[PDB]
């Protein structure tokens, strides 16, 4: 309860950690720790009745967030781990169920059958992109196919639980916590050309309430980099 890191502090009370490993350290690298290990709270999204889902690309959502956005442009390479806190706050009269998963290397498919999606439509800079519950048209040039029952990757949406996941059920649970190590082939990669993780939030059983209650339940995502090291002189 009431953990602190750097100059930021959140309040907690079960944590699922990666593929069984904890994030740890390894020309020559430098390791900065006093100015990157803090909780960058992304701003809150709203969960309405006919909502579909959200996704963030992970070393892209912190590209403008303070000093971590400066070390992405100054240093060429780097490798980090992450620690994700998700918590939505509803009363005892709401109902629903989320799925918080963290997909590594989530390559998405374009709407047009021949092209590839552009940069502005894969990742919103510190802003959540949205799935849809209908199809995306074929006639538009280059946009991400966001049919939520195929999860944008051409896969079954039910089988997405093989990745490290955690259920948020508003009857009994309220929050979720994930710890993800660095999963890549090369031991140190670029941070602009590549997005090695993807955090997805999908509502399976949709929100429902009576007449009178507040018609939206906000979600809060809080990310903190762990054991980061860059490469340069």
């Amino acid at each position, epitope marked *: 309860r009431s953990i602190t890191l750097g100059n930021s502090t959140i309040t907690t009370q079960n944590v699922v950690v990666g593929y069984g490993v904890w994030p740890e350290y390894l020309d020559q690298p430098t390791q900065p720790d006093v100015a990157t290990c803090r909780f960058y709270t992304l701003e809150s999204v709203q969960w*309405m009745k006919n*909502s579909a889902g959200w996704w963030w690309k992970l070393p892209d959502a912190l590209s403008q967030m303070g000093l971590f956005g400066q070390n992405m442009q100054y240093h060429y390479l780097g490798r980090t781990g992450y620690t994700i806190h998700v918590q939505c706050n509803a009363s005892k009269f709401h109902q629903g169920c989320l799925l918080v998963v963290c997909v590594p290397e989530a390559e998405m498919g374009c709407s047009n059958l021949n092209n590839t999606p552009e940069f502005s439509e894969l990742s919103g800079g510190d802003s959540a992109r949205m799935f849809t519950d209908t199809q995306v048209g074929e006639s538009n040039a280059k946009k991400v196919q966001t049919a939520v029952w195929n999860a944008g990757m051409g896969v079954g949406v039910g089988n997405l639980t093989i990745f490290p996941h955690q259920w948020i059920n508003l009857r009994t649970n309220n929050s979720a916590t994930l710890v993800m190590p660095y999963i890549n082939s090369v031991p140190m990669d670029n941070m602009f050309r590549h997005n090695n993780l993807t955090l997805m939030i999908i509502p399976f059983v949709p929100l429902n309430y009576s007449e009178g209650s507040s018609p939206y339940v906000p979600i809060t995502v809080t990310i903190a980099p762990m054991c980061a090291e860059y490469n340069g002189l």
Partner: antibody, heavy 124, light 107 residues
Framework: EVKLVESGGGLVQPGGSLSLSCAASGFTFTDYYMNWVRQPSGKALEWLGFLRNKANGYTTEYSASVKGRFTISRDNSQSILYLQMNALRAEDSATYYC????????????????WGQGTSVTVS | NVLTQSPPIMSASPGEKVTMTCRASSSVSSSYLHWYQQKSGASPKLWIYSTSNLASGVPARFSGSGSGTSYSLTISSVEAEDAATYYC?????????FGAGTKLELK
């Protein structure tokens, strides 16, 4: 009750521009998909495009023939719906409707339940 | 994908049982095919959605059926207010194509 009126039609030169407007009353406007269906003089109907509700990000999906020429948008303050037309040709003389969509189960079948009274646009 | 209705003009006396068809070029799913009814000089109205379910405020004489690529709408008893034009709609990919139209003239 669902009450949809639309206005803005009239005569316009080929190669010109014209902006329609469809007003909605009697329901929550930020919850339903809003379509646009035109129809020529006693012929088969044609579908133009719709605009999604607030829970899906207010995106648009035009048809193939009117892509780049027409533009569907809504106004943030009050409940009204627009359609911006550009580069009109001789075959765009039709009767324009303004339909609503709804969720039947929790699914979205592609039906159009409530239609407007229909405005007319001619070119010459 | 195109829809071809048949027949274009169809006449029926009051009291008989009549039917029309709506044939697609490719396979259209059974939950994405609807029927409309437009009277003379009026806005169209939704009649049957998801190929077998009645709309709100429609009489119980109408009933749709069919699957695969051939669908049909049959009227049990013809009355005096159901003389109009009927369209069928589909969706397999964008755009949403309407049918040609079957006109029902009373006898």
């Amino acid at each position: 009750e669902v009450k949809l009126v639309e206005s803005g039609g009239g005569l316009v030169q080929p190669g010109g521009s014209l902006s329609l407007s469809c007003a909605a009353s009697g329901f929550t406007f930020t919850d339903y998909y809003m379509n646009w269906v035109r129809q020529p003089s006693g012929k088969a109907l044609e579908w133009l495009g719709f605009l999604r509700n607030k829970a899906n990000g207010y995106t648009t999906e035009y048809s193939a023939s009117v892509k780049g020429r027409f533009t569907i948008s809504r106004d943030n303050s009050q409940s009204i719906l627009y359609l911006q037309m550009n580069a009109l040709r001789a075959e765009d003389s039709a009767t324009y409707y303004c339909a609503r969509s709804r969720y039947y189960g929790g699914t979205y079948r592609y039906a159009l339940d409530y239609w407007g009274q229909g405005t007319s646009v001619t070119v010459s | 994908n195109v829809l071809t209705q048949s027949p274009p003009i169809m006449s029926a006396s009051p009291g008989e049982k009549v039917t029309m068809t709506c044939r697609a070029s490719s396979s259209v799913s059974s939950s994405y095919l609807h029927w409309y009814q437009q009277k003379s000089g009026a806005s169209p109205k939704l009649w049957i959605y998801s190929t077998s379910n009645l709309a709100s405020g429609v009489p119980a004489r109408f009933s749709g059926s069919g699957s695969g690529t051939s669908y049909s709408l049959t009227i049990s008893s013809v009355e005096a207010e159901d003389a109009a034009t009927y369209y069928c709609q589909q969706f397999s990919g964008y755009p949403l194509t309407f049918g040609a139209g079957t006109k029902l003239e009373l006898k």
